Design a protein around this nucleic acid. Structure first.
Lengths: 94, 538, 538, 94
RNA sequence: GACCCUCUUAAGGUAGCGUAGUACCUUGUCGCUUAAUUGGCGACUUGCAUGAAUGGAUCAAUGAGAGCCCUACUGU
RNA sequence: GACCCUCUUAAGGUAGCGUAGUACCUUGUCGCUUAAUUGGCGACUUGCAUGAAUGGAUCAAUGAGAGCCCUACUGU
C-alpha cells in the first residue's frame, strides 16, 4: 500500500526530498512534523478523518466543509484541548 | 612492508575490492580455491598457492593446504630468526597479510533424515589453522578473519603506509575469537545431534567494569552480549549519568520487560523500583500514562525508574519534579526535559534506549543457579481461553481490565494479588500486587485490597470530585479486576475480596478446589473468567 | 581396529602405558618430540613424524608439524579412498589413532612485566590441527584428546577389537570441545591483557530438560557445569521423588547458599518459599531448629525446601509427617529415616547432597540481564568494622545476637527487619523478616512485630505460661536484636523498632542523617552497631 | 597432630584395618561408630572429657573414677537424655 | 618525570588536538611514498607562542578552494 | 513391525540381560584374535525354553575354580 520501504529507506521519510543536506537532526524533525501533519484527523463536526490543512493554521473538512483555525502543523493542540476539557469539566460541574 | 596476500576467504564478500586495492599498492595475491577464480576473472592478477608451500593443494572449497613451517612463517615474528625461518625455506614465502574467514557450521536436516555426513564433512579444517597462525602474529603479519573491516585495513595501509600495532592486535584477538566461535559450534551441534547432550557455550563481549554489587567492593562487569536482535540495555544511549550499578541494570530489565509485555500499545509506561512492578498503566498521552502508573504507588515511589513506549516531556516532568527517579528509559526524549532533568536533580540517570520499542528478539533467558544455569524460553503467552466458568461473564470493559492485568501480573513477581483497576476507561492502571507473601490469602490481606483502598483514597482526595470517597469507591468497587498469579486458592478468599466489594477476579484454570470456587463466584455472580494462564511469574 | 598411532601429546601423563599397550597389539607408534623421547627411554619403539611428512623439526614441544593436502587421509574417513589415500602418500602412514592434548594456556605475571612475548608464543598450532582433522573422522581414526581416557580405549581394543562407533563419537566430540576450550582461553586472555575489552565465556555443558517452566508452556532445561567446584545441585541425588523443576532448583540453591553462609560448626537448618529463605535456624540438635523454622513460617511453609546442615533423623522426621515439603536437602541421610520418609510420603523430592559440608568452590554469579552477564565476587563478610557509636553498646553476646542478621539477611531476601534472636539455649535464629517491599521502613511497617509476634503467638498459645501474651512477648522482645539490611534510613523508624520493645537495632551507618541515627539511638536506648556490610545478596 | 591424611586416605578411617573386605557401606558404618565412640565425652561428675569405654556398656572417668552404665558405643543416649530432661522439667515445675 | 610546597599578588589547561594554515629552534625523530623528496600522509611530540560558542575535536555530501600520490594521456 | 481388537477362562515381561554354565535350529551373522579356530572376547539377537530376594544386572579384592590369548621357558 505504501512505497518500497527498502532495508535502509525508512529513515528519511518525507525528508528524502532534501538529500544529504541540512543534517540528520533537522531532517528528522521536519520528517516527524510532516508525518504528524499528514496523519488523519477526525472532524469535530462529522467525526470522520477528513480534516486537512488548507493553509498556515487553517484546516478544512473535505466532507462537511467545516473550516476552522488550529495549530500551524496540527489541527488540534494540547493547550486548546486542555482549555476545552477545563470548560467541559466546569459545564458538567454546574 | 606488507607485500604478500594469502586470501582464501571462505565467504567471498569484499575480496574483489580488497584484492584490487592490494594489487594496486602491489602485494602479490597468492590465493587459491574459490577466491583465485573470482579474482583472476574480475581482473585482479592472482598467483595460485601451488608455488609456495612445498607441495600443492587438494579438494578446493575448504581443505587446501596445512603446511607446518609455512604457517610458522606468517605465525608470529616473520623477522625474528627462529620464527621467521618458516617463511623462507625452499621457495617458502614470507606472506605478511592473511584473511580467511570460516563459513559457519550448519547441520541442514535433509528431507531424508539429517545430513550428518555432509555436515561433518564441511567443517573447515584448513581455514582455522592458517587463521590462528597469522592471528598469533601480534607483531609482523596481519590477519583479518572478519570480512566486515576490509575498509579500515585498506584505509590505514593506503594512508599511513604500514599497519599499526593497535590494529594488528584487534585483528588477531578477533581472529582467534572467530576460530573459537567455529569450534564452539562444532561442539554444540554434534554434541546434540551425534550424542545427546546440550552443551551451552555462551560468550558475553563488551566487558564494562561497573560500580559493585552487594558489597561496596563486589566488583562486577556488565559483559555486553553481542546479540543484534533489538531491545538491549547494552546498546543504550546514556544521555548523561554515572555508571549505573548492577541494581539499576536489573531493574532496567524489569521495567523493559513489563513495558514490552504490554505490547506497548496506547501511550504506556512502566515505573519500576526494587525489581518489583512499581507502575503500569496505559493512556492516550504520556501525561496520563505516566501518572496512571505512578498513581497506584504512594509508598515505594521515590527512587524508581521510568520505562516508556512514547515520549517524556516537561509537561509531566512538572509533577515528576522532586519525585526522586534513578533512571529514565525514554525511546523518544525532549530537549528541554533533557536539559532540566540534567541540572535539576543529578540523580536522573537518563538512560534512553534508541527507539527501544521492538520485538525482544531473543528466545531464551537464564538464571545462573550457582552450579548450573537454566534456559527459560522467551514466552509471551498472555492467555489460553477467555471463558468464565462462573455464569456471569466479563463485559468487554472488564475483559479489557483482565487482559490488562494478564500483561502486568505476568510481568510481576508473583505469589501476589495483582489488582490493576481502571483509572481512565480504556486506559487501565495497576492497583495492587503482593511481593511473595506466605499464602495467597495473606497476600490479599496485606496487599491488593489494602493498597487498592489507600490508592483510591490518595486519588479521591487529591483530585477532589463531588462524589464522596465511600461512594467514589462504591461506583467501581466490584468492577476492580484482579487476575493474580493463577487460580486464587479457594472460594472463601475470593469472598474476602467480595467483602471489599471486589466482584471481579480472574482465575485461570485448576485451583485447589475449582468445583467449589466456581459455585461460589457463580452464586455471588463475581465475574470470574477462566483465562487459564499459570503466569506465576518469579 | 588401530594400526598406527600418532602420539603427539603436550601433557605426557600416562602416555607410556598407552604406548606399551598399542605396541603389544602391534600398533606402530609414529610420534615425535617429548613423547617420542620418553617412549624411546621407556623401552617402547617409536617411529618419528619425519618418516611420515616431509617436515623435519623445530621447537619440538608445540607446533613444528601440520599436514596439508594429506590430513584429508585420516580426515573424516581414513579408508574412504577420496578421503583415505591423502594421509599415507609417499612414505606417509595411515595412522588410525591420534592422541594430541594441549597444555592449558596461561599468561601469569612476571617480576618485570607480563611475559606476553613468550607466554603468547606458546600457542600450539600443530597440535590443535591434528586434533580437528582426526576428530572429524567420526569413523576410522579414534581421537584420544583427554588423557584420562587411555584406560577405556585400551580395554575396548584388548577385548572387542574395534573402538565402537559410540566411543569414537564421544572421543571425537570431546576433542573438538578441547580445542574449543583452548581457543576460548586464547580469547579471554588477550582480551584482558593486550586490549581492554574483556570477554567471559561460560561453563554450561551436559544438559537435561525438566518438566516445563513457571507455566506449562515455559520449558526449562538445567545445564550442568563441567567444573568440579564443590557443593552444587549438579552433584545431588534424587533418591526418590518426581523430577525436580525450575522453581525446585532455584529455591533449593538459595537454601544451600543460606546454610553455607554459616560455615560448618553449629548445627543449622533452613527452609524457603518462592525464592525466600523464610526459616533459618541454628541451635543444637536439629529437631528444635527445624521445627523452630516451621514455627517461623506455619502458613506458606507446606511445600518448601528444607535445607539441613547434616543428616536427618526420625525425631523430626515424625515432626515433618503431614507438613508437606517440596524438597529436603541434606549432606547425607540415615537408612531408617530415609526409608521411613520414602515410603510414608509420596511427593518429597528427597535430594540429599553428597558431602556439602566443605568449601563451596565458587566466587562469582552471573545475573542474566538480556545481553548482560555480571560477575559479582561472592562475599558474605559480616562486617568491615564493628563500631557501635550510639551511647548504648553491644556486649559480646548481644554482638552475636546482631551478627545473626548479617548471617541470614544476606542469605535471604532483604528489605527485611531480620530479628535474629534467642530461642534455644545460646543459639539465635532469625525471628522476623520484612519480605522485601517498597520503603525500607515498610519492612517493620508490616513485618518485624508481625512475624516475631506470630511466632511468639504460636509458642505461647501452645505452652500457655503464666506470663500473659503482653509480657510473654516482652520476655525476648525487650532484648531483641534487629540488624536489618544495611544502614536503616532515618530515626522515627528506629523509634518504631524500640516501640516493639526491641532496644537493639543494628545499622551499618551512613543513611539520610547518621548523626541523628546516633542521637535517636541514644535517646530511645536502641543499641546499634555500625557494621557497614549491606546484606542484600546481589 | 593426626596421621598423614593423604589425598585419598580420609575415607577408610579406623576401617582401614579391614582392607578391601566387607563393603564400603559397612566399613563406613563401623568407622563412623568408632569415631563417635572415640570422641571425647565429658564426665557428669567432674565436667571434663575423661570418660572412656571400659566394656560393653560400662564407662569410666579417668580422673574421678566415676563409673556408670551407658550405651554400648556411646556414653549417653538420646532416650536417656530425653528422660533426664523430662524429669528435670518436672522438678523445675514443682 | 609524576608527587607535599611553592612563585601562587583570581586560577594554573579539563575533554580533546598537536612540528598544525599555529612549532622559532627546523630541512625536529621514525615509518610508507621516490634511485634520490626542506614534500604529502601516519605516528611521536619538550605546545618559542593549542584548547573548548575569543568555540575544541571530527565529519558524509558539496567546492572553478589549497597540497601530495597512482593511472590514462600527451610536443610540457 | 510398532498400533485399536482379540485368544484374554488373574495378568501378559517393567528395569535389565541375552546364541548365555540357559539358544533346539547351531559350527546362527558380523568384527578382533589364527595361514587356517564347532574356540575366546565384542556387537547383533527371531529369548525352542531369560528376568528381578524362584532375586535381575554388575562388580574392586580374593580363588589349588572354569575357558581363551600374549610373553618367557623348556625333551611336550
Amino acid at each position: 500500500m505504501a512505497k518500497k520501504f527498502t532495508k535502509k529507506g525508512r529513515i528519511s521519510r518525507s525528508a528524502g526530498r532534501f538529500g544529504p543536506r541540512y543534517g540528520r537532526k533537522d531532517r528528522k524533525l521536519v520528517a516527524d512534523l510532516e508525518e504528524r501533519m499528514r496523519a488523519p484527523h477526525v472532524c469535530t463536526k462529522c467525526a470522520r478523518p477528513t480534516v486537512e490543512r488548507i493553509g498556515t493554521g487553517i484546516w478544512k473538512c473535505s466532507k462537511c466543509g467545516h473550516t476552522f483555525a488550529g495549530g500551524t502543523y496540527i489541527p488540534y493542540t494540547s493547550v486548546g484541548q486542555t482549555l476545552l476539557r477545563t470548560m467541559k469539566n466546569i459545564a458538567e460541574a454546574k | 612492508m606488507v607485500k604478500r596476500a594469502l586470501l582464501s576467504v571462505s565467504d567471498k564478500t569484499g575480496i574483489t575490492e580488497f584484492a584490487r586495492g592490494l594489487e594496486a599498492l602491489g602485494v602479490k595475491i597468492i590465493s587459491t580455491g574459490g577466491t583465485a577464480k573470482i579474482l583472476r576473472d574480475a581482473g585482479i592478477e592472482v598467483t595460485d598457492v601451488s608455488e609456495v608451500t612445498g607441495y600443492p593443494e587438494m579438494m578446493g572449497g575448504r581443505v587446501k593446504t596445512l603446511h607446518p613451517r609455512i604457517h610458522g612463517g606468517l605465525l608470529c615474528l616473520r623477522e625474528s630468526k627462529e620464527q621467521m625461518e618458516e617463511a623462507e625455506k625452499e621457495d617458502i614465502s614470507l606472506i605478511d597479510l592473511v584473511a580467511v574467514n570460516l563459513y559457519p557450521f550448519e547441520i541442514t536436516i535433509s528431507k531424508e533424515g539429517v545430513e550428518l555426513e555432509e555436515a561433518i564433512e564441511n567443517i573447515d579444517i584448513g581455514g582455522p589453522t592458517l587463521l590462528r597462525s597469522a592471528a598469533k602474529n601480534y607483531r609482523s603479519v596481519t590477519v583479518i578473519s572478519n570480512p566486515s573491516d576490509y575498509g579500515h585495513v585498506l584505509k590505514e595501509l593506503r594512508s599511513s603506509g604500514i599497519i599499526s600495532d593497535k590494529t594488528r592486535a584487534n585483528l588477531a584477538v578477533k581472529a582467534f575469537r572467530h576460530t573459537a566461535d567455529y569450534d564452539a559450534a562444532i561442539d554444540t551441534y554434534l554434541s546434540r545431534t551425534l550424542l545427546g547432550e546440550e552443551v551451552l557455550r555462551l560468550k558475553f563481549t563488551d566487558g564494562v567494569k561497573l560500580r559493585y554489587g552487594e558489597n561496596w567492593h563486589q566488583s562486577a562487569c556488565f559483559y555486553k552480549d553481542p546479540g543484534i536482535e533489538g531491545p538491549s540495555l547494552a546498546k543504550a544511549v546514556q544521555l548523561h549519568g554515572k555508571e549505573l550499578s548492577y541494581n539499576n541494570y536489573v531493574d532496567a530489565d524489569n521495567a523493559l520487560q513489563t513495558v514490552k509485555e504490554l505490547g506497548n500499545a496506547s501511550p504506556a509506561v512502566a515505573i519500576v523500583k526494587h525489581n518489583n512492578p512499581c507502575g503500569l498503566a496505559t493512556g492516550d498521552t504520556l501525561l496520563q500514562a505516566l501518572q496512571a502508573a505512578w498513581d497506584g504507588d504512594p509508598i515505594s515511589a521515590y527512587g524508581s525508574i521510568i520505562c516508556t513506549n512514547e515520549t517524556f516531556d516537561l509537561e509531566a516532568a512538572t509533577f515528576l519534579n522532586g519525585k526522586f527517579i534513578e533512571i529514565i528509559l525514554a525511546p523518544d526524549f525532549k530537549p528541554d526535559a533533557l536539559e532540566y532533568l540534567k541540572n535539576k536533580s543529578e540523580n536522573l540517570r537518563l538512560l534512553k534506549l534508541p527507539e527501544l520499542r521492538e520485538v525482544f528478539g531473543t528466545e531464551y533467558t537464564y538464571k545462573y543457579v550457582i552450579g548450573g544455569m537454566l534456559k527459560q524460553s522467551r514466552d509471551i503467552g498472555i492467555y489460553d481461553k477467555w471463558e468464565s466458568v462462573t455464569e456471569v461473564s466479563y463485559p468487554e470493559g472488564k475483559r479489557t481490565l483482565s487482559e490488562f492485568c494478564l500483561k502486568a501480573c505476568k510481568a510481576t513477581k508473583s505469589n501476589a494479588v495483582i489488582l490493576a483497576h481502571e483509572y481512565e476507561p480504556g486506559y487501565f492502571m495497576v492497583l495492587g500486587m503482593g511481593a511473595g507473601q506466605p499464602n495467597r490469602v495473606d497476600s490479599i490481606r496485606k496487599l491488593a485490597a489494602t493498597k487498592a483502598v489507600e490508592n483510591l483514597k490518595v486519588i479521591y482526595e487529591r483530585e477532589q470530585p463531588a462524589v464522596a470517597f465511600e461512594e467514589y469507591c462504591q461506583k467501581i468497587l466490584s468492577e476492580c479486576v484482579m487476575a493474580s498469579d493463577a487460580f486464587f486458592p479457594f472460594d472463601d478468599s475470593v469472598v474476602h475480596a467480595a467483602e471489599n466489594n471486589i466482584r471481579y477476579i480472574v482465575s485461570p484454570g485448576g485451583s485447589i478446589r475449582d468445583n467449589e470456587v466456581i459455585a461460589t463466584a457463580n452464586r455471588l455472580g463475581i465475574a470470574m473468567v477462566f483465562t487459564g494462564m499459570r503466569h506465576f511469574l518469579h
